[PDB]
Each structure stands twice: as C-alpha cells, then as structure tokens.
C-alpha cells in the first residue's frame, strides 16, 4: 500500500496489486491561464512543475477520473495518455466528453465496483461548492459533480480519497459507513469570488478528527492552482495548535507514503 | 392526483388508484404533553387543530414516514394509527424504532421502488440543516436523515415531496433528473439559533421556479408548530412581489388540490 503525492490532486496509488493514476494533470509550469472568477487570477497554472517525468506516471493499470476540471484533466494529459488506456470516469457526461477527446477503453464506475480478487472501489458523493453556489444555475453546471473514491480490501487498509468537496452530510455519512483508517482530503481552500470556498481547508481537518479520531489525514490539492490559498506551512501550524501533528501528513511533490495492514 | 394539506407536513395523497398518508401528526390542538421538568414549558404545539377527524385520515393503503421528528410522527399518531397498517420508512434505524413501538407491518424504502402496477417511488437524499450544522456531530445525529419522495406513473403527473431539507445539490439534481410538474416544499423557515435555517423558506420557492419554470409549488410545513417562522400571508406577499403568485399554491388546512394529466 503506497499512496504518492504528485501535484495538486494527481496521485499514484498502489493498492492490492494494482496501480492507479488519480486525476492526471500534466501541463508544464504555467502553461495555461488562471481561473476566471476566483482568487489570484494573475497567477498562471500550474504553479509548480512535476516532481518526476511523464513516462513514470503512464506505467499504470488504469486512470481514475473524479471529474473533468482542468486541474484534474488537462490538454497535456489528453495528448500524453494512450487512447487505449483504461479510464475510469464518474458518469456518462464525463465519459462522453473523454470519448469525444479520442479515448475509447472507458468504464463508467458506479456506487459499488467489485473485483474477484477482493478489491472493492466505492463512488461517494460530494458538493463542489457552498449551498449558496448551487442556487445559481450557471455556476451549478460549471462546478458540477466531483466524486470521492473509497478503496477496500481484506489485505489492505481502507483509504478514502474525498475529492473536490466541501463539508456536506454525504461526506459525514461516508466516514461513518466506511470507517476509513486513512483519509485523503483536497484541502486547498480554493476561493470563488462571490460564493467563497469551493473545496475544503484547515478547519475540515479538525472537524474530521472530531468525527473520526482513529483516522490519519493526508492533505492534497495545495500549492499548484492559483485560487488555492491555504499553504502547507499554515496547515502545519494549524496542526500544532490543536495537538494533531502526527495524525496530519502534508506530503511534498513526489513524496511516497506507505501504510501497513495487520 | 388528489393532494390534501392536513397540517404541517401531514398530507394524504390519492395517486394511481392508491391512498397514502405521509408524515402523520395526529395530536390535538396544543396537546403535546411531553414533560420532564421545564420551568417555562412551551404549550403552543400544535398551534392548530386537525381540519378533519382522524377516521378520514386512516382510510389509507399505507403510511409513509420521511423521518421520526415529532412534527412528522408524534405519540398521538403512534397510538391512533393501527399496528397492522403498512408503514414505509426511510431506512433501517427508523424501521427498528417504529417496530419497537408496537408496529409489525413495516417496509424500508430503497432508493428506487418499482411496483408491478406501474407506480414507482424514488427516495431522495436531503440535508436537514446547513453545512456548518453537520460539522457538529451532536447536531448531526439530532437533525439526522430525512428523505424526499418522488411519485412516478403514467396516467398521472410526477410529484416530488422534498421534505425536511434546505437547499443542497441533491435537491437540485432531483429537480433536474425527475423533472416534476408538482414540487411540494416544507416552507416553515424554522431556524437554528447559531447555525441558520434547518428547512426551506420563501427564498427557496423562487430559486426552484427559476430552475424549473414549468413546475407548480405547493407550500407546506407552516403555521402548525411555533418554531416555523414563515407565515401564509408573508409567502403570498413574497410571491406577488416576484410575479409568481399563481404558480405558488399555499393551501389551507383541509384543502384538496386536483392535478390531472389529461382531465
Ligand atoms: Zn474541481
Ligand atoms: Zn480541483
Ligand atoms: Zn424534521
Ligand atoms: Zn419538520
């Protein structure tokens, strides 16, 4: 069991024999523009370069795509990844636009996804914006859906990749139901101009340990996209103030993290 | 259809040749006598009496409970509804509770409930509170889960009882998916002291109709318990203001509305 932080929410995961590339964003440093209608629009994306070359990321059994925002799936990854690569997608909408980009080996993943060997991937709901944001029609379609992944196995520990979501009840029900020993949160604190936080921040790391004390949080989706304000040093400082230093890991780009089972 | 507003979220729904009683609150006017030792016990609930006798309410094929909050399922209803009645519950814990209160003919609503007759009943996920409220683990369990209900059938228009939820995207996706001609909202505007509104209000009437302008809104869950701060008169005054007065139905207690697909 080896979870590795690449850049933003791009992750490499070894889990029960198989390997997964989660949300591959592989543009060069400052290739495309900053997000309009968000914080720090002057900063170009991505802010940081990749910690390792592209060929190392392609050596993977399947790509998993939580949603099709540009920081999770860019023009570079469309060019770079083979069209016969096994892409897991959130829904038919996502699969349809990936199909029109030239890809064809696609499995639209669903609430429960079982493998004979004992692997089980679950697809969990979130909310990529505030209750106020989704009252708007236009911004609703733009922020859209963005799932979280729960990987279960008998030989391995349960890990929960929560995805681009703010604190909503479906996140709470997912923690209670799956009781995950490891939790990966997108803790960038990305600010929309007129509706505020579209994903989690520092406070959501406290809230989750209050909800699930035995869990160990891995903070991702940070220092990469222009609107993500919450830096690594600030979260690390927030850890110390609440007495939760060893329970919050803040991996650097390229940092592999290992977790045993029994 | 024939939807009858009873009082609060209590209503009877004649749909596809079958009658249901959704969320029965059957206590008399100001009759909730639950007491431990309060110095200033509020004796306002229920604010209004039943507009019809209890006998008329029970002439029904099954009861449907969105959740077990007292304003949807009180002790009076737990006594008055017979134990051999078919009760449809939201999930396993509410079924267990209802079963341990003497009832034995209980069923749990799945996410989809396709019956051979052609009637389909979809269970919806809401949020009974703000995002902040559910960060509190104590108030998470207290407000808990509370499901919406869609009813689907040919020969009949599609109706969505949203239930005790504030505006979250699972509510928006339900309007986008099922596309109901009738959306029944719980517009009490009950508010938590520090964490803001716990159910829908006047604002949520307009935001739906912008999303789905064909639809007709039936207002409900108000002027029954004192904690619901929205008045009949205020919502009508709000509807006249934004030019939607004849699309916002605000029925009296006991009023029945007909909704036919053909005639
Ligand atoms: Zn996103
Ligand atoms: Zn993102
Ligand atoms: Zn309630
Ligand atoms: Zn209620």
TrEMBL record, chain A:
GO terms for molecular function: hydrolase activity; metal ion binding. SUPFAM superfamilies: Metallo-hydrolase/oxidoreductase. Signal peptide: none annotated. The keyword Glycosyltransferase does not apply. Coiled coil: none annotated. InterPro entries: Metallo-B-lactamas, RibonucZ/Hydroxyglut_hydro, UPF0173_UPF0282_UlaG_hydrolase. Zn(2+) 2 binds at residues 71-72, 164, 221. Pfam families: Lactamase_B_2. It comes from the Bacteria. This is Putative metal-dependent isothiocyanate hydrolase SaxA. It comes from Pectobacterium carotovorum (Erwinia carotovora).
Automatic annotation (TrEMBL), chain B:
Zn(2+) 2 binds at residues 71-72, 164, 221. Keywords: Hydrolase, Metal-binding, Plasmid, Zinc. Transmembrane segments: none annotated. It comes from the Bacteria. The keyword Cell division does not apply. The keyword Hydrolase applies. GO terms for molecular function: hydrolase activity; metal ion binding. Residues 20-222 form the Metallo-beta-lactamase domain. Zn(2+) 1 binds at residues 67, 69, 128, 164. Pfam families: Lactamase_B_2 (PF12706). PANTHER family: L-ASCORBATE-6-PHOSPHATE LACTONASE ULAG-RELATED, UPF0173 METAL-DEPENDENT HYDROLASE MJ1163-RELATED. This is Putative metal-dependent isothiocyanate hydrolase SaxA.
